[PDB]
Design a protein around this ligand. Sequence first.
Ligand SMILES: *C(=O)[C@H](C[C@@H]1CCCNC1=O)NC(=O)[C@H](CC(C)C)NC(=O)[C@@H](NC(=O)C1CCCCC1)C(C)C
Ligand SMILES: *C(=O)[C@H](C[C@@H]1CCCNC1=O)NC(=O)[C@H](CC(C)C)NC(=O)[C@@H](NC(=O)C1CCCCC1)C(C)C
Lengths: 306, 306
Amino acid sequence: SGFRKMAFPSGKVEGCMVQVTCGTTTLNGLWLDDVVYCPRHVICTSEDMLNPNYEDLLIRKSNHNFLVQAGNVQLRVIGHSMQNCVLKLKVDTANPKTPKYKFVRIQPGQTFSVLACYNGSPSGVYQCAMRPNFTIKGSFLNGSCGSVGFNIDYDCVSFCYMHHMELPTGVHAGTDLEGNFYGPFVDRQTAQAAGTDTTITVNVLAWLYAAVINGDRWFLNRFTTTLNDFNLVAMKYNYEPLTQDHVDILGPLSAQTGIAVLDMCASLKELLQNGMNGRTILGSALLEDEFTPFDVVRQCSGVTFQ
Amino acid sequence: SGFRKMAFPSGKVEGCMVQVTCGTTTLNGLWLDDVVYCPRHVICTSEDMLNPNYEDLLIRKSNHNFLVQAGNVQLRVIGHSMQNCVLKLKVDTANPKTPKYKFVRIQPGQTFSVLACYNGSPSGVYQCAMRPNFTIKGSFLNGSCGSVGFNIDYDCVSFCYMHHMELPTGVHAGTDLEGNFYGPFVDRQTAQAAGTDTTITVNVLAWLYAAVINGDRWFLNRFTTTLNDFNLVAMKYNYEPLTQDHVDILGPLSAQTGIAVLDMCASLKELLQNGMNGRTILGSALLEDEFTPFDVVRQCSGVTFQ
Ligand SMILES: *C(=O)[C@H](C[C@@H]1CCCNC1=O)NC(=O)[C@H](CC(C)C)NC(=O)[C@@H](NC(=O)C1CCCCC1)C(C)C
Ligand SMILES: *C(=O)[C@H](C[C@@H]1CCCNC1=O)NC(=O)[C@H](CC(C)C)NC(=O)[C@@H](NC(=O)C1CCCCC1)C(C)C
């Protein structure tokens, strides 16, 4: 038993991290086959980031201006191209540690593991969720750009996020591996408003199901509710509306616990309107919304990866 | 900025996990050089675990009775020995993925990363702390035994924990890699009382320092306190006493924030006696005690590993 914030094993991603240096700016790159992917603002100076002209800055750069180091061995760049907000540096050596990989663009509410790196070396791994406002609540310092978010399915690593910037709110914004930002953000040091965040309701319900599987059942009440009446209450507390698709995704958890989804919604409705009265659920005094139903079933059934 | 529960990169440990099968019982093993380490109750049946005679059970076992598989390749056992509560299976092939490693016995209050494995395949990675009562609050299912806890220092993996059992309280007990249990526990299915847990005070203070570094400063009050008067209040709320050694360990965090340790203790004293009044610190409504001062400085300074 037990339930913990669990991240994917990072071994397959660790073998792909390199250091990319262009002048003074050094950050991390993703070495897949004979291509190194990294944020394009590596070609920027501190004065350029206020309003950078990336194409103009890149034209003044040639292949030798990019210092790519994998561990202690330097990789030679033999070509560079810019795809949206990421640079693609073709190197003369293909990464022998390249795993089976995929480039995916995740949806809001989905989770992924972040491998925080500095100077091409991993610092730690943690689990994140794509917030409804297309930000993430990560842990990034100077030089962390190029760190990637990923999921592992069987033996295939699904790269879905690359870190680019931090907003003064404390949250972080980035792109997919094709260079397209998540949300209305741009890679420039200027005022950008992030929309108000919302609680991921289907993830809270999945977390409550995990609590039942682990023996934390005090919050279960004797009532049921309709999907419409639940969403009217959840909307009041800044919860996303629960769709029938979300009810279907919670199917596996509902059958394992014998608790209908609308019955669990009735318990969540009482938790929102009355609070916890100083009690905890799975060791938390707040409702957790960064566990997908797939995360819950994977941890509660022991799904492994190759 | 930002602060997350962060685990070490698991790549160096992933290359050491194998599947160990003895009859029906299958669990995980740690393949280091030409030795595979695994919990000794792999030689037990479900009826044996009530009161097992491990030496008698092992004498009836020969080398071929241990099926060790690394991925899809079977490793041949050429010798077996029992050291306390772990089996040491000598295999004819030395693990080419063996990293620089060390066997350490951690102290209560220290943290480490757990790589949860099933059938020798990693499922996820998360950060744990050795509770004062020598248990851990992990996430383990059937077949997780053999999963190891570890820290990474520079390039050396310090193995410190191997999972053995779960108590009905929901907590988990295990051994170091020499087979010696943490706490007064034995590897048998019988009633065993775990001592009452205690909040790790120096870790809470380190967590409050992390909050200040990340801009969460509302809890800082204008008062100071003595080390003795703080421990009298902390004892009332089941906090471990703060020693001068703990004050010295908090030195780096105190100098970075300019907040004396006894000043932060005065703020923690007010938090304990008055609560948070519905407010959060680093997104938590409860005080976190599973971050060491070393964990805080590593995440707040970006320490990497080879
Ligand atoms: C890359 O390594 C770096 C990581 C940042 C900086 C360090 C703090 N935490 C991080 O994740 N990214 C970086 O420097 C960004 C470069 C882009 C401008 C291309 N810059 C930022 O992230 C800056 N953030 C902002 O300017 C926001 C943008 C929208 C709202 C106003 C301020 C930070 C603050 C340096
Ligand atoms: C090994 O894979 C397995 C992992 C356990 C079992 C599954 C639940 N979560 C885990 O971590 N360990 C295992 O089966 C133990 C074998 C030893 C007896 C050698 N058994 C247990 O962990 C059992 N726990 C107990 O018997 C406690 C011991 C002290 C208090 C009374 C009950 C579990 C409950 C099967």
